[PDB]
Write a protein that binds this ligand. Structure first.
Ligand SMILES: *[C@H](C)[C@H]1/C(=C/c2[nH]c(/C=C3N=C(/C=C4\NC(=O)C(CC)=C4C)C(C)=C\3CCC(=O)O)c(CCC(=O)O)c2C)NC(=O)[C@@H]1C
Ligand SMILES: *[C@H](C)[C@H]1/C(=C/c2[nH]c(/C=C3N=C(/C=C4\NC(=O)C(CC)=C4C)C(C)=C\3CCC(=O)O)c(CCC(=O)O)c2C)NC(=O)[C@@H]1C
Ligand SMILES: CCC1=C(C)/C(=C/C2=NC(=C\c3[nH]c(/C=C4\NC(=O)[C@H](C)[C@H]4CC)c(C)c3CCC(=O)O)/C(CCC(=O)O)=C2C)NC1=O
Ligand SMILES: CCC1=C(C)/C(=C/C2=NC(=C\c3[nH]c(/C=C4\NC(=O)[C@H](C)[C@H]4CC)c(C)c3CCC(=O)O)/C(CCC(=O)O)=C2C)NC1=O
Ligand SMILES: CCC1=C(C)/C(=C/C2=NC(=C\c3[nH]c(/C=C4\NC(=O)[C@H](C)[C@H]4CC)c(C)c3CCC(=O)O)/C(CCC(=O)O)=C2C)NC1=O
Ligand SMILES: CCC1=C(C)/C(=C/C2=NC(=C\c3[nH]c(/C=C4\NC(=O)[C@H](C)[C@H]4CC)c(C)c3CCC(=O)O)/C(CCC(=O)O)=C2C)NC1=O
Ligand SMILES: CCC1=C(C)/C(=C/C2=NC(=C\c3[nH]c(/C=C4\NC(=O)[C@H](C)[C@H]4CC)c(C)c3CCC(=O)O)/C(CCC(=O)O)=C2C)NC1=O
Ligand SMILES: CCC1=C(C)/C(=C/C2=NC(=C\c3[nH]c(/C=C4\NC(=O)[C@H](C)[C@H]4CC)c(C)c3CCC(=O)O)/C(CCC(=O)O)=C2C)NC1=O
Lengths: 160, 159, 169, 65, 160, 159, 160, 160, 160, 160, 160
């Protein structure tokens, strides 16, 4: 769903026409879409650098990459990079849509089930998503970093 | 139109390609004209349903005739309510910029619904054509083109 | 696949006309032949598995090279395939007996038969030869349990022959 | 809009085909317009449908799936 | 039976049952009362039928009575007696029913895999059911006998 | 009905089960009554098309009306020719004993044909109902039941 | 399953032959099959008219077809017509079989799970099946309408 | 090929001698050859009258001989008469041979290719062959008209 | 392929950069894309009306829809409507691409093989595509009807 | 997994090199592999005889093969033979691997779910696996029969 | 084409002069031409004896020369001898050219089309070409029999 599609749905289930508050919501979305698109472009620029900096901030040189940790095996390191790239990409989609429903529908659906099945540590994942959020808020600026951090904190809060 | 590009790039494992970002930026630019067109169709609804019922019942009198479905005041009120519904979905498609939230509510199962209601679908298509003509008279040239876009989609869909 | 009643329907449908006297005449022929055809098919269905074995026995009595080195029914792995082809020919002959046409044999048996048999190196001469050991035995079994006139039992095996036929005249 | 279904379909014809005899009890997600014919196909084999659960989708929402 | 056939067909292809099939239904319903009287006759004297059947078996093949055979030993000798009665019980169920498939489902599907690693040979079962067939159509009226013969010879060919 | 049992036992690797042989023997027994019913519907065709056009144009006058399809002598002649075609297919289904050679020629793609011809299918269903009523008046009770069988199949098929 | 197949099964699991009570059951089924076939034919005549009359009796001009209701969207109206056609068709199959097991096996298996997953109102479905039952009992007569209403009330009771 | 040559071929490809069924086939052919020869003589009598009566029955005074039709030009009318004379002559040959293989070998080989290349209407040709069949079955009698109509309907069925 | 993709390919296989003639071709395509899109929209409006008018112009009331013709059976009439809808839809795709390669790749690949296998008349298909071309050139105007008729005549010429 | 692969995994997740205890485990496996291979060969010799003797010991002449039991229908007898052959074959695989993980991964995963869904009696299955274990421990000797009975008792304990 | 002409063509399509690798190829051909010419002479000596010995090895006294086989008729035996003489003669031409292109151009072009049209058995032809290859490799020696068998196996592989 969108913010546009959410506004249209909320006006639809009442049978209501588009009143002035919904037009205010759509015009606010049409105002913010500029920096939304620019932020999505520069996040699509260097996603690999963001994931590299995030694991170098949070996960590297810990016991997690040591033997016994969950990132010791090299296929598990590759799976870690894959999961962080997923979090960043779906946070980009939720930032450009302006509605976190795609995070609820595609990422946060059965994820705690999987992470408790595999024995994946949840707190280290939350700290890695936090480091992702700090790196991309530094990279994109504060004004779009707020909206990026909202959906990354949404993923972090639903994960916990 | 953002959900279209998002599920389009989501079936692939790739990101949103920046040509899609260009089309989203252009839609974001045209959104103000879209909102003005939608408000102009919004506030003048009862005129459009009146002129659509005018042109339809002048065009096809069998709904007026007692063998047809829209016979009597109750059935003709349900008929103009259906035209009101389709005008509402056209305004939704004008705002959304792409015909997904109007096809999801008005198109995707309409043939079997109107078949098991007894009404013909061609008369509904003529009613949406009358709505398109009345909105073409109501709007300017670049607005009537962009409204007749989605009205044209509904007319092609009901056939 | 067309029945003996549906083939008339196709022949009369392509002309676009109704039923006339002649089609009703052949339908009366088929409808008084049907009670005898069902009994003949039950009699062949009853003793079919032993018919296959005796057909194999007389087929190996005829041409010795079928169960010799340079043959195709050499091992049991290559013998069971020849015996299930005997099973197939008898099955579709009973299908053509209850249908009353040769269109079942045409459409389901004969249509790709040359391609498989030339593909697998399978001979054709001993195959039609075995088909007719089958029909001599089937004529004996139909004549045992009642039915006097046995020409409708006689025709579908011969139609299978005439299309598996390597025609030299 | 996806469903999480647990089901059990015995073929009742493995003894005359001599098949692999693989497992017939699964927990799978199926999309919205696909679960219809999946329902129907599972009922064709007389299969028990244990539990149907929502994976993706809020019910009662009209636009945006 | 025929209603299984028509209902599984018409459901398998998402339509209502055709009318030639309904005419097959009601001529089956008329044929059923003769079916009831013939299955009542075979439920009358099954004792004679299994006694004849065992006797014709032990006139037909002497290797079951020789030691190292399957009828040798008192237990399996007493077993084959009720086995004959099971097969004619299935015949009674089938000769009532419009089709052989609910009886095919009960006793015909895996015959080879069952009797093969059971000890008894399938070339003996055809002689067993041949004796059962002889002992059934002596004990019935003539066209009833001609109507109940095909179920016997169906089971006969399904053995070998 | 023999092709039905043959492809039915042919999808399986089994032979024709003798209950199917019983139904073929019973159809072979009833074939004489089938042939008499088909000849009685054969020789009286123009009466049946006349009374069907009678009852249809009394029931639905919109085909007579100039907005409908069957307006004028040429279009009404094509209409009665369609009813003649359906009576012919009903006689084929009466002889064959099962509705396969009539559905193969008249049912299996009829909705899109009549949709791209402009005619409504419900009027064709009412025409076959009128044919069923006229043949019910023409035949005896056990003959009208067995004719209204296949007429009933066509009426259910056109809807 | 049939009524014939149920009688054969109940006689089979005891090892019992067909006694006179089972023959009474089969002969009662062979008596009732006449009106069973005639009722199935005239229900297959005008199933669309029955579904149309049932929604015009029960579901139309309510809040259910208004916005906010579950039949507001036109794909949901088409799904409603599909579900009612399913109920009528499988009730026809259970009427001609004379045994409600196909309703338990093919319709009522996981249906409350689906209707509580989608948010489908159950009471409106029960009232729609009730209107279906009244329309077809008027259309077919009382004598076959009783047996039609038995299986339609079976669907309604299992749904609740 | 003949019926004699077909019987000899079917006996030859098996390596079979002439058994009694083949002798029955040859003796049936030698019985029917009388009316075969008499029918061929009276069809060779008045073939032009048969073709004239057939075009007067089926093709004349239609739109086909009007301008725009395929028989408008006089060379196309002469080609139509030629094709109908071909159908009648080769049907006479197939009637006297008692085997339709010469129709398959000499007429029906590449004929649909030609008639779809030239734009020749196929249904009018089928109706013209039907009118030929009715005229010659009236002219020769019913008993030989059956065998004439078999090969003319063979041409009509292969053409369609 | 496109006209853009064809220009890029023709510049690529030489190793050539985009010279001024290729830029002229791309700028001509970017000039004509306006009426290309408008024509594609109004052809997508009423494709069923175009196919209906085309069969009413060319194929109806001929011998083709009479018995014996290739459009007599109602499944064959539905297949005819399907083939004409295919020709119109792929001509719309080739008009909007500005390059007939998709007609060569998706329609005209093995089509004469199929139409000579099934016995489909080719000349009637060519006349039906001609009637399609006249109807859509009337409906869309002359200026886009030229480009529509180019690809429809391409289908007609490759079919012959 | 193997015993080799389990030793390598247990040394890997610590980051440990192969110390002397792991080399002791691998050398014990390389000592026992002789009788492992010989036992697997003679169990692969006569698996059908083992399953036949096991059903003759435990399941035959009970109420289970009588009507009402779960092995009454002949497809259910074939399914019983199929399940016992599975238990013996996967116990052979676990014996030659020297690690019961393939039993946990391929057999014992969702098996109690299936056996409680179908109504399969669990205690009779446990006694049948016990009879399998006694027959193969007699057939192979005591020294390899211990290791065969370990994995067969593993299947029996996980089943309960 | 030749080996000389193939070398000249491969040097020509690059615009390359005759480099040392091409001169090596031509000098190897000029070395092998001695035994090429001697082998071609002694194969031209007794081609009829080779074909006679090959049919006596492979095709004679089979079912192929029996009635029902493809070599039963004496014109078909003469056609068989003609085809084998063709294979041997064109293999001689390809051996003396040192390039199999004449086999691809003159023999293997439309040969599977012809052999599947006539119903000619392909596997018996492959075995006959194999017997040809064995006979001429015995007759000419091993050193030229290798090059003869290369082109005969080329014909056999393209035929299959
Ligand atoms: C009996 C004491 C001795 C015996 C007799 C015997 N065999 C046959 C018939 C056949 N035997 C085969 C054999 C095989 N097929 C294989 O794949 C293999 C593996 C190498 C063997 C051994 C086949 C195919 C037949 C049928 C065709 C034929 O006649 O050869 C008969 C004839 C039976 C009959 O009349 O139908 C007899 C008497 N074989 C023995 O094992 C004993 C030494
Ligand atoms: C036996 C009389 C002759 C013979 C037979 C033989 N056949 C095969 C192999 C196959 N035969 C078929 C035949 C059919 N398939 C069909 O669908 C139909 C119509 C219903 C027929 C007639 C097929 C498909 C095969 C391939 C095996 C398979 O079924 O997958 C063999 C085996 C060849 C081999 O060497 O493997 C044999 C021996 N051979 C004779 O000598 C008799 C003349
Ligand atoms: C927003 C999506 C949407 C659609 C499309 C929709 C259609 C819709 N049209 C209806 C009735 C109707 N619709 C018509 C339609 C017409 N009059 C004619 O003659 C023409 C053919 C056509 C309009 C010009 C008529 C006459 C009825 C009453 C029919 C009856 O009472 O049986 C009904 C049943 C009564 C109701 O609850 O309103 C529905 C649900 N409802 C929806 O929520
Ligand atoms: C309802 C379909 C059906 C039937 C009929 C059936 C029979 C059946 N026969 C059995 C054994 C047997 N069956 C026979 C049978 C025979 N011995 C002969 O010589 C004769 C040819 C033949 C019939 C008398 C013998 C000898 C055994 C004992 C095998 C053994 O235990 O060594 C057994 C295993 C032991 C038992 O439970 O009694 C079953 C279940 N099973 C089924 O599912
Ligand atoms: C045997 C299978 C078969 C069918 C079903 C069939 C239908 C058929 N109906 C047609 C026309 C027609 N069909 C009708 C039908 C009707 N009049 C009405 O008002 C009612 C709705 C209905 C009959 C009572 C009409 C009015 C036309 C002329 C329509 C036109 O000219 O556009 C045509 C085109 C003209 C022609 O070639 O005859 C076909 C092919 N043709 C066939 O070969
Ligand atoms: C053969 C037995 C059987 C049934 C019944 C069945 C039902 C069924 N109904 C569905 C949806 C639905 N079912 C209904 C039905 C209703 N909602 C109402 O308000 C009314 C009370 C009621 C109609 C009388 C509606 C409105 C939907 C649409 C939900 C959606 O798709 O968004 C779906 C979801 C997917 C789909 O339709 O294609 C299934 C599987 N499947 C089966 O296999
Ligand atoms: C996208 C390009 C494309 C085309 C065109 C195509 C055609 C096509 N047309 C077919 C049949 C057919 N095609 C026609 C069409 C015609 N016959 C006539 O008389 C008219 C001249 C012409 C209609 C204008 C008819 C009547 C059939 C029915 C033959 C049959 O199915 O029995 C078939 C056989 C199977 C089927 O329809 O479903 C194919 C594959 N497939 C393709 O992928
Ligand atoms: C590799 C591990 C594995 C196992 C074991 C397995 C078992 C399994 N056993 C089944 C049925 C069955 N299983 C049994 C077995 C038994 N019932 C008894 O009374 C005895 C106690 C026991 C035999 C020793 C029977 C009788 C059925 C038949 C139920 C039926 O199909 O109607 C089915 C249902 C479908 C089918 O057989 O083809 C499965 C999946 N699948 C697997 O993948």
């Amino acid at each position: 769903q969108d913010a546009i599609t959410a506004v249209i749905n909320s006006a639809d289930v009442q049978g209501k026409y588009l009143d002035t508050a919904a037009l205010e919501k759509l015009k606010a979305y049409f105002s913010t879409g500029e920096l939304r698109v620019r932020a999505a472009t520069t996040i699509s620029a260097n996603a690999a650098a963001i994931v590299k900096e995030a694991v170098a901030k949070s996960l590297l040189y810990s016991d997690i990459t040591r033997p016994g940790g969950n990132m010791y095996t090299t296929r598990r390191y590759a799976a870690c990079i894959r999961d962080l790239d997923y979090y960043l990409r779906y946070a980009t989609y939720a930032m450009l849509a302006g509605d976190p429903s795609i995070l609820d529908e595609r990422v946060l659906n059965g994820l705690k089930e999987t992470y408790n099945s595999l024995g994946v540590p949840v707190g280290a994942t939350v700290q890695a998503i936090q480091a992702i959020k700090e790196v991309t808020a530094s990279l994109v600026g504060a004004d779009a970093g707020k909206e990026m951090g909202i959906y990354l904190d949404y993923i972090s809060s639903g994960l916990s | 139109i953002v959900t279209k590009s998002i599920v389009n790039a989501d079936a692939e494992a790739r990101y949103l390609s920046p040509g899609e970002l260009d089309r989203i930026k252009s839609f974001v630019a045209g959104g103000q004209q879209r909102l003005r067109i939608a408000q102009a169709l919004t506030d003048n609804r009862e005129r459009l349903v009146k002129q659509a019922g005018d042109q339809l019942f002048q065009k096809r009198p069998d709904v007026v005739s007692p063998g047809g479905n829209a016979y009597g005041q109750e059935m003709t009120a349900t008929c103009l309510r259906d035209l009101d519904y389709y005008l509402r979905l056209v305004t939704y498609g004008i705002v959304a910029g792409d015909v997904t939230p109007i096809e999801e509510i008005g198109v995707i199962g309409v043939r079997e619904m109107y078949k098991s209601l007894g009404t013909p679908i061609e008369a509904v298509g003529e009613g949406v054509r009358a709505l398109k003509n009345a909105a073409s008279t109501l709007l300017s040239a670049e607005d009537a083109a962009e409204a007749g876009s989605y009205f044209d989609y509904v007319v092609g869909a009901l056939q | 696949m067309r029945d003996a009643v549906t083939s008339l329907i196709k022949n009369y449908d392509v002309a676009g006309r109704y039923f006339d006297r002649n089609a009703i005449d052949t339908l009366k022929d088929y409808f008084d032949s049907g009670t005898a055809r069902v009994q003949a098919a039950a009699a062949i269905n009853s003793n079919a598995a032993a018919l296959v074995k005796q057909a194999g026995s007389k087929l190996f009595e005829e041409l010795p090279e079928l169960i010799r080195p340079g043959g195709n029914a050499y091992t049991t792995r290559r013998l069971a395939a020849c015996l299930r082809d005997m099973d197939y020919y008898l099955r579709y002959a009973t299908y053509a007996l209850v249908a009353g046409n040769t269109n079942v044999l045409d459409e389901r048996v004969l249509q790709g038969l040359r391609e498989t048999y030339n593909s697998l190196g399978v001979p054709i001469g001993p195959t039609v030869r075995g088909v007719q050991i089958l029909k001599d035995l089937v004529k004996e079994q139909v004549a045992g349990a009642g039915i006097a006139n046995t020409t409708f039992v006689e025709e579908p095996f011969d139609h299978i022959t005439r299309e598996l036929s390597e025609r030299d005249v | 809009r996806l469903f999480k279904i647990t089901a059990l379909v015995p073929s009742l014809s493995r003894t005359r085909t001599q098949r692999e005899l693989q497992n017939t009890y699964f927990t799978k997600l199926v999309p919205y317009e696909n679960w219809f014919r999946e329902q129907q196909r599972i009922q064709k084999a007389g299969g028990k449908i244990i539990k149907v659960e929502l994976a993706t989708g809020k019910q009662g929402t009209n636009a945006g799936l | 039976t025929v209603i299984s056939q028509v209902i599984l067909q018409a459901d398998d292809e998402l339509r209502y049952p055709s009318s030639g099939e309904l005419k097959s239904i009601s001529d089956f319903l008329q044929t059923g009362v003769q079916r009831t009287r013939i299955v009542a006759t075979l439920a009358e004297n099954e004792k004679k039928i299994v006694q004849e059947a065992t006797k014709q078996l032990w006139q037909k093949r002497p290797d079951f009575i020789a030691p190292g055979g399957n009828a040798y030993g008192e237990r399996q000798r007493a077993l084959c007696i009720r086995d004959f009665g099971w097969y004619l019980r299935l015949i009674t169920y089938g000769v009532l029913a419009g089709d052989i498939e609910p009886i095919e489902k009960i006793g015909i599907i895996g015959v080879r895999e069952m009797y093969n690693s059971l000890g008894v040979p399938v070339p003996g079962m055809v002689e067993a059911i041949n004796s059962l067939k002889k002992a059934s159509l002596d004990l019935l009226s003539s066209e009833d006998a001609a109507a109940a013969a095909p179920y016997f010879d169906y089971i006969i060919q399904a053995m070998s």
